[PDB]
Design an enzyme around this catalytic site. Structure first.
Site, PDB file in Angstrom:
ATOM      1  N   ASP A  79       0.811  -1.217   0.000  1.00 20.46           N
ATOM      2  CA  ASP A  79       0.000   0.000   0.000  1.00 20.46           C
ATOM      3  C   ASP A  79       0.846   1.270   0.000  1.00 20.46           C
ATOM      4  O   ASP A  79       0.495   2.258  -0.642  1.00 20.46           O
ATOM      5  CB  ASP A  79      -0.957   0.012   1.190  1.00 20.46           C
ATOM      6  N   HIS A 121      -4.741   8.062   7.223  1.00 22.75           N
ATOM      7  CA  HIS A 121      -4.400   6.752   7.796  1.00 22.75           C
ATOM      8  C   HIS A 121      -3.093   6.694   8.580  1.00 22.75           C
ATOM      9  O   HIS A 121      -2.935   5.857   9.482  1.00 22.75           O
ATOM     10  CB  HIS A 121      -4.371   5.681   6.710  1.00 22.75           C
ATOM     11  N   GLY A 129      -2.212   2.793   4.101  1.00 17.42           N
ATOM     12  CA  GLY A 129      -3.236   3.171   3.135  1.00 17.42           C
ATOM     13  C   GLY A 129      -2.905   4.358   2.249  1.00 17.42           C
ATOM     14  O   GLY A 129      -3.689   5.303   2.167  1.00 17.42           O
ATOM     15  N   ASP A 245     -13.928   9.172  -2.838  1.00 20.02           N
ATOM     16  CA  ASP A 245     -14.106   7.755  -3.145  1.00 20.02           C
ATOM     17  C   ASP A 245     -15.494   7.225  -2.762  1.00 20.02           C
ATOM     18  O   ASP A 245     -15.786   6.046  -2.959  1.00 20.02           O
ATOM     19  CB  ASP A 245     -12.972   6.884  -2.564  1.00 20.02           C
TER      20      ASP A 245
END
Ligand code: B3N
Ligand code: K
Ligand code: K
Ligand code: ZN
Length: 354
Positions: A79, A121, A129, A245
């Protein structure tokens, strides 16, 4: 009275290089520019965060590690790839949000915008993240110098775990996150029963939501929570994360929102007339993310924008319809009414303690 817009060509180019969202900063800025909205804002060049400014949250060992991998563990991996741009990216994003915070402190504006920020995050010594540095935390700590109680509202699809955890033991910063909460879905935290710890118990608020939520229900939920939060917490400043998102058309294909619904939430926060730091976040349909944050900038400016996307650098990305409005996908809302009511009652019960 005129909102601050954090921007420089160098900053956009820097942000454009995050490999997860290539060119997204340019697309957002270019569309905002195409609607000529930047001319209604005070354009402020972001400063680069110093090592000491970044160390107000992140540990020196973590920051030195970013510096090391940028020149030659800690949550780096799939990530959060360890690539050479990492340290400069962190300092730039962090610096931009700190600049926004400082403008708000100096009374330069009531609203300051960093659309390339909102990386919620990251923890003090762990990347997570796509977040190498937590600029949201940095902005909150800067605002804290002047404002006694800060409200962090996180409307990204994902739980704002980095920010909530950072301030979990305090009542001077309240975090509120609406997000998808479903076993297997990143980051896996943020149930309604997560309320913070110690002196901060009941000063973390989480609204676990399911796939398919649309504008009207989402705003009803958001308004309900925020109303109680405002009266109980009485915030002096607001940090608002608006990851796109959640928007219909995102490849994550979870929530089913339009910028109009998010805008209603934004409007509700703006009528409090508090110092407000505006941040971006996730958003993986790049053109839609630009559509969203352009529309929201319009909302901040109290302007209504022409439905037709103006020709500009990225005009070809706006097919097949070439309009600013986003149509919700035709799929079901998995949120059953009784569960939603249970959640709202649980939160209300929590806020009585505040
Ligand atoms: C198509 N592909 C290779 C992948 C797609 C999704 C993920 C993922 O969600 N990973 C877990 C990390 C999610 C980060 C979400 C960042 C965000 O939007 N935070 O608000 C990984 C790979
Ligand atoms: K969220
Ligand atoms: K808290
Ligand atoms: Zn997200």
């Amino acid at each position: 009275l005129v909102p601050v817009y954090i921007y420089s060509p160098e900053y956009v180019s820097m942000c454009d290089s995050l490999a997860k969202i290539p060119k997204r900063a340019s697309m957002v800025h270019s569309l905002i520019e195409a609607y000529a909205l930047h001319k209604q804002m005070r354009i402020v060049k972001p400063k680069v965060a110093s090592m000491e400014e970044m160390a107000t949250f992140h540990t020196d060992a973590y920051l030195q590690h970013l510096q090391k991998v940028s020149q030659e563990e800690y949550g780096l991996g799939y990530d959060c790839p360890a690539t050479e741009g990492i340290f400069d990216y962190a300092a730039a994003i962090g610096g931009a949000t700190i600049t926004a915070a400082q403008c708000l402190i100096d009374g330069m504006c009531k609203v300051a915008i960093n659309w390339s920020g909102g990386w919620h995050h990251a923890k003090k010594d762990e990347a997570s993240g796509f977040c190498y540095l937590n600029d949201a935390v940095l902005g909150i700590l800067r605002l804290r110098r002047k404002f006694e109680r800060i409200l962090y509202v996180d409307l990204d699809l994902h739980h704002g775990d980095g920010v909530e955890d950072t301030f979990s033991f305090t009542s001077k910063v309240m975090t509120v996150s609406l997000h998808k909460f479903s076993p297997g879905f990143f980051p896996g935290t943020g149930d309604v029963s997560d309320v913070g710890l110690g002196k901060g118990r009941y000063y973390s608020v989480n609204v676990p939501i399911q796939d398919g939520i649309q504008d009207e229900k989402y705003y009803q939920i958001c308004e309900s929570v925020l109303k109680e939060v405002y009266q109980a917490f009485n915030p002096k400043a607001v940090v608002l994360q608006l990851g796109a998102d959640t928007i219909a058309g995102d490849p994550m294909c979870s929530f089913n929102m339009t910028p109009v619904g998010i805008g209603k939430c934004l409007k509700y926060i703006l009528q409090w007339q508090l110092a407000t730091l505006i941040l971006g976040g996730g958003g993986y349909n790049l053109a839609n993310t630009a559509r969203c944050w352009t529309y929201l900038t319009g909302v901040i400016l109290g302007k209504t924008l022409s439905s037709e996307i103006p020709d500009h650098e990225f005009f070809t990305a706006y097919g097949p319809d070439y309009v600013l409005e986003i149509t919700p996908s035709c799929r079901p809302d998995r949120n059953e009414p009784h569960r939603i009511q249970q959640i709202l009652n649980y939160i209300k019960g929590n806020l009585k303690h505040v």
